[PDB]
C-alpha cells in the first residue's frame, strides 16, 4: 500500500504521533515521505546485511528481526515482516521506540525534514 500524504497523516495522528516525544505530526509524515515515499512495502537492502523495512524504512540491525541480519537487536521486539503491514501500526510503534531511545535516527528526516516547515506535510489534510 502506498499511502496518500493526508491518509498517512491521519493514520499517524490516529497512532498518536502528533507531538509524540515533541515531534509535530508533519515530522513523521515527512519522514515517511522521504524514507519510503509513503510505500508501506518499501524495502531497501544495505551492504551491511541489514534491510530497511516499510513506510519508515526501519532497519533490521537494530529495530526489528528479519532473521537474516547479523547483530540483530530487535529493539522494537518485532519481526521486520510486521513493518510491511498495510496498516502503519508496527512501523509507528517501532518509530516511537526509535525516537524515544530525536528523529535524527531517520537520516532521511534529519536531511529532508528537519529544518523545513514539516507541518506543511499535514496541510490540506482532514485531521
Amino acid at each position, epitope marked *: 500500500k502506498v499511502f496518500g500524504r493526508c491518509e498517512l497523516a491521519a493514520a499517524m495522528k490516529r497512532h498518536g504521533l502528533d507531538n509524540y516525544r515533541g515531534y509535530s505530526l508533519g515530522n513523521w509524515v515527512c519522514a515517511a515521505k522521504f524514507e519510503s515515499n509513503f510505500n508501506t512495502q518499501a*524495502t531497501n537492502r544495505n551492504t551491511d546485511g541489514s534491510t530497511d523495512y516499510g513506510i519508515l524504512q526501519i532497519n533490521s540491525r537494530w529495530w526489528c*528481526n528479519d*532473521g*537474516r541480519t547479523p547483530g540483530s537487536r530487535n529493539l522494537c521486539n518485532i519481526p*521486520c*515482516s*510486521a513493518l*510491511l503491514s*498495510s496498516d502503519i501500526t508496527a512501523s509507528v510503534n517501532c518509530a516511537k521506540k526509535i525516537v524515544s531511545d530525536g528523529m535524527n535516527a531517520w537520516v532521511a528526516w534529519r536531511n529532508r525534514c528537519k529544518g523545513t516547515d514539516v507541518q506543511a506535510w499535514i496541510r490540506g489534510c482532514r485531521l
Partner: nanobody
Amino acid sequence: DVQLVESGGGSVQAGGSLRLSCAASGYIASINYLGWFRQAPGKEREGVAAVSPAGGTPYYADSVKGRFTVSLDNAENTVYLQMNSLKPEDTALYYCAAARQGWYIPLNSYGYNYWGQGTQVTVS
C-alpha cells in the same frame, strides 16, 4: 490483510497420510512465506514446512523432510502439506501461517504475520 483457512486435518493411523490445505485470501501478494507450524498439547510449536510463493522454494523441519512435502498452488493461493508416513510424533495442531517479506527463517514462527485456526492432526 490476509486470511488463512486450513482444512484436511483429522485422525489417521501411523503410516497413514493426510493432506492439509491452507487457503490464503486477501493481500496474497504480501506473502513471502506460507508455512505450516504444528504444536502438540502443552508442547512448543514447530515449523513443519514453508514455501515462498514467488520462487517456490520449500523448507522442511528435519523431522518431516523427506517424508512430508509442502506444495503451493499459487493459482489458488493455497499451500498444502502432504503428510505421508505419518507417525504418532506428528500428532499436533497444524497451523497455517503466512509471513510477509521481512522474515527469512521459514520454520521460525516469529516473523509470521498471519495465522490460520490450526487443524488437528492425530496419528494413532
